[PDB]
Symmetry: D3
Subunit: 157 residues, 6 copies
């Protein structure tokens, strides 16, 4: 009956993301994780890998499903039969830009956006910083799900 | 099944508040508006009046109910059988303090807080500023529900 | 006697921009809209089109003129015989960077910068977001002047 | 023809304030400094003293006048025959609250608010902090006009 | 040779404070915790209790000492023979005000202020919020040192 | 015994940077300025020039040394035998991103980051803005050390 979409590029999914997925799943009947296609083909992990990593990291959430997103997030949301987006806040989130998009999204499609602060212990990880630190030899394994750590280790090896 | 609490002093409720109530009511099975008791007895409208104003302003939301809150918001939330708080963001919201409380609330009770930006047209009204402007002769009637405007006019007359 | 410059790339001009033009025109004897040349040739609309769109959108402001800007904004301002820049604030404005530039501009040329918040209804449109939403099929026509909507429709068709 | 109001409590006026007065005076035909009456009678300097200090500190600005303000700033502004307020930004300014008031002021009276960053050297002085530091023995004389320093010294002696 | 002062009211000291004390103690030869006297006599714990709680919570830091502060922080710092203040940042810190004071402190006494972010797990506790939550029955014992928890329990009992 | 690292690209070093170097040098036994290698080869000044400019600008600080940094800042810091990073704050600093990195750096290496506000007069210069203004003909010589001004003049001539 109720449903939320959690959109992002998830390249790769972090435990900050999983924290938000868990909170959405506890508060909405259904959650869809929408993985957005990388535009100018510039990510670390390809689409199939990103899907697998999210799936493997959310087996404990039976009301959550993973789908590839295309086009405007709001079009995806309304195609899911939902009218809510749930987005996490962390240290370094461009909140003003998130607010601009939220207001635009409301304006064009009537879709609401609910923001929720990620757990403090996961509040400083982002996909980009995690990748950059890992590529330079740093240990971010406590900030990422094990399905991601396995793949990250493989690529770096 | 799902439920959110919208806590505040609502002295008086504004159309910014009503906007948030509407969005919560559209996304959760049940919404409880929790009116917090004024501590050192310093408000404009007494408790009965604040309750009436919220009730009269939300007759179009059948899954919403109004209750007086006492003690920690999280205790109230869990007594409602819920684990979510929904709070609006407007211009002038002390967001950093809201974030601090959200993290504390999560820590002590496991209760999640979802923030949602109020509609732009209602983004600059707050109970305090509305009262201050009205007391000095300014017209804020477009920013408040008619049940509030009626009472505000009476008190000022 | 008094004069302000409103600089930007205006690719394309939005109703947020027009709101600021109107306020500048009401408060200064003369307003010059300075359209800055796109550096690495990467915009949607070419210079002639951007000029036309601003002109066509400001026919109701007889003390406003449109000019192409080159080089430092402050050099342009002082060449106009003015010493004031007027810039709008919206949701998503990089205000800290605007402040840095304002202080630098004051330092190098003695030119003052006055910031003014755009109307709430136009506070979430930006040229970039408007283009991105339009390219993906979203309706932003309420946020742009009709001379822009006409051209945007043509390019998308 | 053009005119701006610079409202505040000016208890006492600082060189940050004078910087803003100077910029307003350079960009508008007329400037009115509106000294707001202290509500619950809690300031350091009484109204006559605040007026004198502003007057004595602005003798070099012949298009500026000082007046006592009463009621809503916007009512004062429109009574001056103006529709613009000019406010300074410094370190510690509650900008979000200033923005809320600006949007409210626009809404109720159509009055525009222009914000301008104070000079870096005067960006950390405020009336409150200056008083608090002076009362505890600190030298803030470089941050205040000499007419204020004279009076501050007298009161502390 | 090197020395930093950590000033505050510490009513009571939290584990966020202790985190900052630890980092200061690791980076400076000597650290002085300066407990500021409560002005209008409005705290929860009296001076002797606040001193005891800080002392009892920092026995593992032999280069740290606790002293009562009086007057301007910068006067205290320079009386300690130091020229550095170390202050923690947490969620809800009024950073703009901290920056204003830092710039003022530099201006009047040449004293530098170094800010350091508290550990994420302790980033949402503040003395005020901890007291307010405890008074309303909430468990904040994981966020405060045991010497504080002992005293807090006693007062609440 | 105590030591801090001041990392950056310093392309070129500004007086804002030198201000921070001076404060670090006054508060720590040793300071290392770590010049990070430009990734995709895109700077104005090459590595040898950046080193020379920092050296020539810090001859008055005998406890400061300049080194080329490689890899994670925290790896460099710990290789210096230190556990502190000192970073300046100016107008336009992406503080939220600096905070994210600080928390990540603490997490992966136990290294503390101390932030210190640059002097107001140097608070609006950044390497990027200085270069952009200089390339367009503006005079930024008061914001940069003379060793930089000499080289900047040569390149522009």
């Amino acid at each position: 009956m109720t449903g939320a979409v959690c959109p992002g590029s998830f390249d790769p999914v972090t435990l900050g993301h999983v924290d938000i997925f868990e909170r959405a799943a506890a508060q909405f009947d259904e959650v869809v994780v929408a993985i957005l296609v990388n535009p100018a083909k510039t990510g670390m992990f390809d689409l199939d890998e990103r899907i697998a990593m999210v799936k493997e990291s959310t087996t404990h959430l039976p009301n959550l499903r993973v789908q590839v997103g295309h086009g405007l997030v709001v079009d995806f949301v309304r195609s899911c039969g939902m009218t809510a987006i749930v987005k996490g806040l962390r240290t370094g989130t461009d909140f003003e830009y998130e607010l601009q998009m939220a207001q635009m999204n409301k304006h064009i499609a009537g879709v609401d956006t609910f923001f929720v602060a990620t757990a403090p212990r996961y509040s400083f990880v982002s996909s980009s910083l995690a990748k950059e630190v890992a590529m330079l030899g740093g240990d971010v394994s406590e900030l990422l799900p094990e399905p991601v750590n396995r793949r990250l280790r493989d690529r770096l090896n």
